[PDB]
Design a binder for this molecule. Structure first.
Ligand SMILES: [Mg+2]
Ligand SMILES: [Zn+2]
Ligand SMILES: [Zn+2]
Ligand SMILES: [Zn+2]
Lengths: 49, 310, 256, 69, 45, 49
């Protein structure tokens, strides 16, 4: 615990001391650049993509 | 024709065509997946400006503006330099027409997809010999209508005439000419399936906007969409204008849902003759059973006895 | 973890006796008639497999082969008991006619209690390093000793490990044990099929000069065996040419 | 959010004591220390595990369920 | 084809590719993709 | 055994800060190069240098 380190209890960590949920949101759009140039949401296949 | 100048990246030891290649981005490597041999290393994955070579073409230009320390006599002379250029007069007028398209779409508060579709429609129908004598406001109006139809955000000729002061006859002529030009461009280049986007009626797309203008609930809007869809099966009223079909279906569902809006108020809001609305309601009164959505009367939210007789 | 330092070649049937005499002069050892019925098993196509293994390294499916001898009474067609088993019997074996047939190899595979000894060999593609003048291949092999149970057939054992039969070939040849542990084999190969046998080495004998080294990490041993192979090559120049065969040919992986 | 099952420091089960703690607070009119003592939390680690717990789960529950059966 | 739930009215809907992403019962434009039907494994630590 | 010193002991309010070591640990042997200088890129999310 020297130079501002700390010793935390591993048993307290196991029982839930300072456990946290982290949420990250990923935003995506499909946009129409032109007539046939339009993005689309689909499951891609390696044979044709 | 011309030099090849193409790098075909194959494993020199597996000798398999087509080569099974993994581009390991995190390791900056391209490897042959069969044997693990690294074919090319030091992979290349801000500083410039975005430019789409489909809307304004392959045009590269920079403007002149005031800096941190700038005398105004030098800026005025340099601003006249870009203006007094004869090589890019076509570029200047097509950018002016794009600016007019954008300001018209902004005054109408149309979405960016409508702006982009109208701009591309104008660019594809530009400098065509069949479209030379038509008025520029008619070109703008027809491009806006084409953009709305292509974005499925379709407005009507009355809407585009409320925006642009354009005569109806040569507006229709310009729209027909630009549709022919766009079909020719599609046949020459990439082919597009219409799947009912350029259709003249499009009466299902006018119901939610008109219901919003009348302040109608969502269930009334959906019932009006169902009635307008079922009016296509009726022979006698399918020849009417899509605006009239949508308005009489909306008014029928208003009378069905007891919405306290009169036919005169509907006509004043949607620019349809009150006599036309009344005639459409009196002729759709005979086909009440088919038009009114069946699970609505099954759930009892509306009943067919509510509609006034003729 | 053996490595086979190997060179390959071929001769015609007319030069077989001349090569036998020449190699007898080279080695001082008479040729040794041998056979090994090799049965090849590929992973079951009805079994969905993963490209990864127990560890996180991704591997290809590989054909694994089982080889064992056949007694020469089963290769004598009741007409050459009188001639002894030597190098001279390989001149008669030129066509597709071999007494060992698909029905009897199926009988051998299905054991119709205890099974005969087998050698389970697994071999990958030879090394891609284009700095060795000889073909270096890695082979892992066990000796399957015996079997029992109501499901004791070696074919059903291979099915239990997950491999189905693909093809089988009987090879018959003569080998020389020459100076410093170099085994040079000279063999004919026939494919055993229900439609009929086929002489793969049509009209000639295949030549394989190989040395087995237990530790392929021992670079001094690898270089010593390699230069023994090149000494054999220099001694054999003018008559027959020793060359490295294709790694695509020596690869036993299942393609997809 | 919701009361922890165990005390962080020692591992004494405290998640069964939350409803009885609330009942001792609101219908027996005990102050919080006597309520903790009657629950049997004698170590101040176990005492603060219940005393300092902010029970946000009904604040989360006042929102309508996103998937309703 | 795929299962969605409206944001505030909690209505279940089935959507294909060509369907507009809107609620059919209340007209809301926010839909949440349904929880997966498969069992999901969590270590209890 | 008893510690010879007696320890100042008791509850204290502590805050979990959002600088976790897993959001900061970063190593790169080789990776993507920049477009212009062809030097290693910036950022641990881009596997940078
Ligand atoms: Mg510091
Ligand atoms: Zn390769
Ligand atoms: Zn405790
Ligand atoms: Zn809804």
């Amino acid at each position: 615990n020297q130079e501002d380190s700390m010793i935390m209890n591993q048993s307290s960590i196991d029982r839930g001391l300072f456990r946290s949920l982290f949420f990250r949101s990923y935003m995506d759009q499909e946009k129409k650049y032109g007539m046939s140039i339009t993005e689309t949401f689909e499951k891609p296949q390696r044979t044709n993509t | 024709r011309g030099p090849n100048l193409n790098i075909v990246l194959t494993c020199p030891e597996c000798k398999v065509y087509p080569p099974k290649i993994v581009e390991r981005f995190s390791e900056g490597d391209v490897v042959c997946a069969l044997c693990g041999l690294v074919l090319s290393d030091k992979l290349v994955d801000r500083v410039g400006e975005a430019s789409n070579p489909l809307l304004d073409g392959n045009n590269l230009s920079t403007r002149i503006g005031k800096g941190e320390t700038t005398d105004m006599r030098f800026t005025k002379e340099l601003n006249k330099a870009q203006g007094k250029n004869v090589m890019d007069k076509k570029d200047n007028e097509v950018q002016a027409a794009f600016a007019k398209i954008t300001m018209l779409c902004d005054a109408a508060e149309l979405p960016k997809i409508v702006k982009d579709c109208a701009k591309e429609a104008y660019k594809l129908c530009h400098d065509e010999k069949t479209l030379k004598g038509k008025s520029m406001e008619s070109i703008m109006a027809a491009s806006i209508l084409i953009g709305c139809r292509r974005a499925e955000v379709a407005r009507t000729f009355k809407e585009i005439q409320s925006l642009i002061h354009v005569k109806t006859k040569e507006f229709g002529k310009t729209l027909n000419i630009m549709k022919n030009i766009l079909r020719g461009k599609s046949e020459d280049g990439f082919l597009k399936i219409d799947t009912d986007n350029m259709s003249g009626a499009q009466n299902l797309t006018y119901i939610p906007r008109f219901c919003s203008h009348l302040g109608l609930p969502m269930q009334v809007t959906t019932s009006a969409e169902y009635t307008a869809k079922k009016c296509k099966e009726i022979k006698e009223i399918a020849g009417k204008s899509p605006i009239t079909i949508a308005v009489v279906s909306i008014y029928l569902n208003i009378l069905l849902f007891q919405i306290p809006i009169t036919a005169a108020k509907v006509g004043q809001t949607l620019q349809v003759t009150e006599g036309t609305i009344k005639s459409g309601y009196k002729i759709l009164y005979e086909h009440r059973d088919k038009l009114v959505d069946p699970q609505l009367i099954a759930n009892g939210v509306v009943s067919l006895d509510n509609l006034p007789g003729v | 973890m053996v490595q086979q330092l190997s060179l390959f070649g071929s001769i015609g049937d007319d030069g077989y006796d001349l090569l036998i005499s020449t190699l007898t002069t080279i080695s001082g050892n008479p040729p040794l008639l041998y056979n090994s019925l090799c049965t090849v098993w590929k992973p079951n196509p009805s079994y969905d497999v993963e490209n990864v293994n127990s560890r996180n390294q991704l591997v290809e499916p590989n054909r694994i082969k089982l080889s064992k001898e056949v007694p020469f009474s089963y290769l004598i067609d009741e007409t050459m008991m009188d001639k002894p088993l030597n190098f001279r019997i390989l001149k008669s074996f030129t066509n597709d006619k071999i007494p060992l047939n698909y029905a009897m190899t199926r009988n051998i595979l299905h054991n119709t209690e205890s099974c005969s000894p087998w050698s389970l060999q697994i071999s990958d593609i030879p090394a891609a390093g284009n700095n060795r003048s000889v073909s270096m291949q890695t082979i892992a092999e066990t000796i399957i000793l015996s079997s029992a149970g109501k499901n004791s057939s070696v074919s059903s054992l291979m099915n239990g490990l997950g491999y189905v039969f693909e093809f089988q070939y009987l090879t018959i040849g003569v080998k020389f044990f020459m100076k410093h542990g170099l085994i040079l084999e000279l063999q004919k190969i026939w494919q055993i099929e229900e439609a009929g046998n086929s002489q793969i080495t049509s009209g000639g004998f295949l030549l394989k000069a190989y040395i087995n080294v237990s530790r392929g990490t021992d670079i001094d041993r690898i270089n010593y065996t390699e230069t023994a192979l090149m000494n054999l090559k220099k001694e054999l120049q003018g008559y027959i040419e020793l060359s490295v065969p294709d790694r695509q040919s020596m690869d036993s992986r299942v393609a997809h | 959010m919701i009361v922890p099952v165990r005390c962080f420091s020692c591992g004494k089960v405290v998640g069964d004591k939350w409803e009885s703690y609330l009942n001792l607070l609101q219908e027996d009119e005990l102050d919080e220390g006597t309520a903790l003592s009657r629950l049997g939390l004698k170590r101040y680690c176990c005492r603060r595990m219940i005393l300092t717990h902010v029970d946000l789960i009904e604040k989360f529950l006042r929102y309508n369920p996103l998937e309703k059966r | 084809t795929l299962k969605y739930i409206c944001a505030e009215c909690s209505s279940k809907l089935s959507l294909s590719r060509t369907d507009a992403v809107r609620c059919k019962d209340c007209g809301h434009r926010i839909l949440l993709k349904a929880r997966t039907k498969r069992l999901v494994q969590f270590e209890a630590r | 055994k008893k510690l010879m010193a007696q320890i100042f002991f008791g509850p204290t309010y502590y805050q979990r800060l959002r600088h976790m070591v897993d959001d900061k640990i970063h190593a790169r042997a080789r990776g993507p190069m920049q477009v212009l200088t062809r030097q290693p890129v910036e950022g641990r999310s881009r596997d940078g240098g």
